Design a protein around this ligand. Structure first.
Ligand code: HEM
Ligand code: HEM
Ligand SMILES: *[C@@H]1O[C@H](CO)[C@@H](O)[C@H](O)[C@H]1NC(C)=O
Ligand SMILES: *[C@@H]1O[C@H](CO)[C@@H](O)[C@H](O)[C@H]1NC(C)=O
Ligand SMILES: *[C@@H]1O[C@H](CO)[C@@H](O)[C@H](O)[C@H]1NC(C)=O
Ligand SMILES: *[C@@H]1O[C@H](CO)[C@@H](O)[C@H](O)[C@H]1NC(C)=O
Ligand SMILES: [Ca+2]
Ligand SMILES: [Ca+2]
Lengths: 10, 244, 141, 146, 281
């Protein structure tokens, strides 16, 4: 998968 | 990293902290379920160029997530190690994917052009030149490749090349590298920050690609541009290696 | 990153130090052994007592090195190369210590020269000692 | 940490003469000036770009005052350090996520501003004691990070 | 020749700047490789800008953009135009745009020398007018040959030439020349060797000054040691009283002063208390 951190930086 | 942006959430789950035999903390990034990229340089600390993979592999200690210790089977070096500065570490088993631990995707597209911005994490030193007690991160713009070339050496044309490097040692600068500018607030990336990935978040398709890995982590305060080796250029090489 | 402004400031401030550069260099050293006893593990055979002649002279050396660096400051690492290799490899000095001595040198110089330390100068002085302590450290591996 | 009586005595006797309406704010705005990236946390104040704006802006010294006080409270009872800064530690670490190293940098610029005002009478042993103090403070304030 | 244009760019006027040539409608630059005063003299003549005054690399006008048209030019300095000098051909170069040559010509440079806050019109802090603005010069490397050239240009006696600022304020604005090292035969200070214009590390505390004298106004005396042969060394220069600082003062200097004064040899530089005369700045 790409692009799905549980809590991104933003 | 000397300046700020404490890593509160763990927004960078693919960052691994590998410590060499003499307690030197260094960055490595988890590139897929079984493998993590790093630099040939990082691999070669406290070892001779004579040393081969079998020699180097048992020496290292590696950490993912918080303290999480993943073991390490073999080690493979880029055939151009002295020019393209890249290793690969294969982990003895799989790592459980979850919110804090998870590999990064290798990019198909190439975002090397100036005007883009990226995010570099790091475990490296700070403005007290202490190894940081907690992982941090910083945003950096990408810098004009010519300004960077003329910056670190003198030339363009290879016969006028001279060691203009603000620090003692000269960085590797070729067609497989790109340079990232200085911060907005003049923050930069120092000892220990090699092997961390220059990760650009693509907002339309919302994915974080690793465009480059940081090679030259010496620049710190003194040298206006950090320099990364594009991962896209080792694309077709890493795939060949994954099959073994 | 040492802009023209910084460089000018550092020169103008380090001039007003003049011949006193040596004794401050030594006073600074004294503080580290008193403040941070671990740095003493690099100087086993030195007499570490108050105002020791050995301390005073080593301080005169580090002072003169610094004055040399600032005399032609636009290429410092060539000038300091042999000290790069001397501290990096032979002595293997742990990079935190340069930032220690940097700070002791700023407090000491502050104490003795109150009138010139307006913030801009404290800034470019800290940058200057940063840039140097890096260049000495930058051949570490 | 433990401290022998004549360091604490020289510390408190020196701390009495320290002007509490200026020094703290000067240390803070100096940290802001020398390491401008901390402006990122305080930029609600106004223009922090030049040193003259920083030095003039009444909110810089207004904040510094509260910080200088908090440090006075630290220096008062140095044996129970954890509890006194426990709340400030929650404010800075959990909501703001300030990196604790800039605490020591500030403590150092403080001792610097101290030395600036107190000249030759601020001696290497007394400095070494205040270093011990701003250390113990930085540690207690950083204790909840592990 | 109708498709050949020349201009100077970014030097504040038409007679100073990076060399730009318009050919077939595109502007491009010239490399500073083997570039010298003869090339600039050709350029300044071609532009009717007078004599060549200065050449510099890209550092002063910034990097250019586009093709580099010429490299390793060889002019004798008498050619009617730069593109008539021998060259390897258009667009043949090894240079980058960081090696783009620039020039300053005399009508675009505007030079004048004056003294300010002097004891005389030929002493004081030295200021040069450049392109209409006056600024001072820093003292780094300023020597007696530079002072001698300045004194000669002012038409004052050059038998004795001092450095420094007597009653001269600190300058403001630009420091135009730094680390001047002349041989003394040059007719004006801006033809001696110097670094690139306006690039300096000096501050206005390091501003150069001069005093030009024939020696008739220089007096030396000892005061306050109870005799003419002991005391503080007082000097009178241009009717200004001052004292010698002890930094660098040894038995050699004292013995020289006593011998010149016929006081024999210096034995010792000591205390003998006294009612001495005060004070100076
Ligand atoms: C601003 C950074 C520094 C400068 C400019 C500096 C300068 C010098 C100089 C000039 C010498 C003498 C070289 C010679 O005799 O050939 C020297 C030697 C030495 N330095 Fe430093 N130094 C710096 C940092 C440090 C630090 C932080 C330490 C340890 C805390 C250190 C430890 C030593 C030692 C042990 C020697 C050899 C002394 C001897 O055996 O005579 N240096 N350094
Ligand atoms: C290490 C010694 C420090 C002390 C003793 C201290 C003390 C204080 C105090 C007393 C306040 C005001 C709390 C209130 O209004 O009740 C405060 C607020 C604050 N602190 Fe600090 N502080 C320290 C270090 C730092 C540093 C170095 C930073 C950032 C670079 C920081 C970030 C902040 C911020 C941003 C606020 C404002 C919070 C707000 O009003 O929203 N702290 N601190
Ligand atoms: C690191 O390298 C040095 C230099 O050769 C070597 O002597 C040492 O054994 C290595 N390991 C450690 C832990 O210092
Ligand atoms: C440094 O490495 C040595 C040798 O392996 C070890 O004993 C020591 O605990 C290490 N120190 C740190 C701070 O990790
Ligand atoms: C390493 O560089 C050499 C020299 O150009 C080249 O022939 C070789 O293919 C490179 N290695 C790889 C794996 O491409
Ligand atoms: C030097 O001092 C003042 C201030 O510049 C000046 O007017 C005066 O003429 C000079 N001294 C003498 C003795 O003329
Ligand atoms: Ca050429
Ligand atoms: Ca000269």
């Amino acid at each position: 998968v790409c692009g799905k951190p549980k809590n991104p930086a933003n | 990293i000397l300046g700020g942006h404490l890593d509160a959430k763990g927004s960078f789950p693919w960052q691994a902290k590998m410590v060499s035999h003499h307690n030197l903390t260094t960055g490595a990034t988890l590139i897929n379920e079984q493998w993590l990229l790093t630099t040939a340089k990082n691999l070669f600390l406290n070892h001779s160029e004579n040393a081969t993979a079998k020699d180097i592999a048992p020496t290292l200690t590696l950490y993912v997530g918080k303290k999480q210790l993943v073991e390490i089977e073999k080690v493979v070096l880029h055939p151009n190690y002295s020019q393209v500065d890249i290793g690969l570490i294969k982990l003895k088993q799989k790592v459980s994917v979850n919110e804090r631990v998870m590999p990064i995707c290798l990019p198909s597209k190439d975002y090397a052009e100036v005007g883009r911005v990226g995010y570099v994490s790091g475990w490296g030193r700070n403005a007290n030149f202490k190894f940081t007690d907690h992982l941090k991160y910083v945003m950096l713009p990408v810098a004009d490749q010519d300004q960077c070339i003329r910056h670190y050496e003198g030339s363009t044309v290879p016969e006028k090349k001279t060691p203009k490097s603000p620090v003692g040692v000269q960085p590797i600068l070729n067609e497989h590298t790109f340079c990232a500018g200085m911060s907005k607030y003049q923050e930069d990336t120092c000892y220990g920050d090699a092997g961390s990935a220059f990760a650009v978040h693509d907002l339309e398709e919302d994915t974080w690609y690793a465009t480059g890995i940081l090679s030259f982590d010496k620049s710190c305060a003194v040298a206006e541009y950090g320099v990364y080796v594009k991962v896209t250029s080792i694309q077709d090489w890493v795939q060949k290696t994954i099959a073994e | 990153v040492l802009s023209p402004a910084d460089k000018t400031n550092v020169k103008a401030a380090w001039g007003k130090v003049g011949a006193h550069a040596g004794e401050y260099g030594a006073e600074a050293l004294e503080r580290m052994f008193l403040s941070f006893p671990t740095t003493k593990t690099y100087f086993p055979h030195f007499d570490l007592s108050h105002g020791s002649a050995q301390v005073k002279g080593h301080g005169k050396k580090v002072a003169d090195a610094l004055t040399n660096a600032v005399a032609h400051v636009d290429d410092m690492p060539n000038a300091l190369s042999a000290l790069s290799d001397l501290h990096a490899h032979k002595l293997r000095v742990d990079p935190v210590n340069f930032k220690l001595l940097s700070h002791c040198l700023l407090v000491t110089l502050a104490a003795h020269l109150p009138a010139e330390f307006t913030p801009a100068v404290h800034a470019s002085l800290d940058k200057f000692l940063a840039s140097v302590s890096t260049v000495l450290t930058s051949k570490y591996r | 940490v433990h401290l022998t009586p004549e360091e604490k005595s020289a510390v408190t006797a020196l701390w009495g003469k320290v002007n509490v309406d200026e020094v703290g704010g000067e240390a803070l705005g100096r940290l802001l000036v020398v390491y401008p990236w901390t402006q990122r946390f305080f930029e609600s104040f106004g223009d922090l770009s030049t040193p003259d704006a920083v030095m003039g802006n009444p909110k810089v010294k207004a904040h510094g005052k509260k910080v200088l006080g908090a440090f006075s409270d630290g220096l008062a009872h140095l044996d129970n350090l954890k509890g006194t800064f426990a709340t400030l530690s929650e404010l800075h670490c959990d909501k703001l996520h300030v990196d604790p190293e800039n605490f020591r940098l500030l403590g150092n610029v403080l001792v610097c501003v101290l030395a600036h005002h107190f000249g030759k009478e601020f001696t290497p042993p007394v400095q070494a004691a205040y270093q011990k103090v701003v250390a113990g403070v930085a540690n207690a304030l950083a204790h909840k990070y592990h | 020749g109708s498709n050949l244009e020349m201009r100077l760019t970014r030097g504040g006027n038409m007679c100073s700047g990076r060399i730009e040539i318009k050919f077939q409608g595109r502007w491009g630059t010239v490399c500073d490789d083997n570039f010298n005063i003869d090339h600039a003299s050709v350029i300044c003549r071609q532009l009717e800008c007078g004599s060549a005054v200065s050449f510099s690399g890209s550092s002063n006008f910034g990097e250019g953009s586009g093709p580099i048209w010429f490299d390793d030019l060889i002019c004798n300095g008498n050619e009617s135009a730069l593109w008539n000098c021998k060259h390897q051909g258009w667009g043949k170069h090894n240079c980058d745009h960081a090696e783009d040559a620039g020039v300053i010509c005399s009508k675009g440079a505007d030079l004048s020398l004056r003294l300010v806050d002097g004891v005389t019109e030929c002493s004081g802090r030295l200021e040069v007018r450049f392109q209409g603005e006056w600024g001072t010069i820093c003292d780094d490397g300023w020597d007696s040959y530079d002072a001698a050239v300045a004194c000669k240009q002012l038409g004052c006696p050059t038998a004795v030439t001092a450095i420094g600022r007597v009653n001269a304020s600190k300058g403001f604005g630009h420091i135009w020349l730094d680390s001047v090292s002349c041989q003394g035969h040059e007719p004006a200070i801006w033809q001696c060797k110097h670094h690139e214009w306006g690039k300096h590390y000096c501050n206005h505390n390091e501003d150069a000054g001069v005093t030009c004298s024939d020696g008739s106004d220089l007096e030396l005396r000892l005061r306050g040691g109870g005799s003419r042969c002991a005391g503080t060394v007082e000097v009178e220069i241009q009717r200004l009283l001052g004292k010698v600082c002890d930094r660098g003062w040894g038995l050699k200097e004292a013995d020289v002063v006593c011998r010149q004064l016929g006081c024999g040899s210096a034995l010792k530089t000591s205390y003998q208390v006294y009612s001495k005369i005060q004070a100076t700045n």
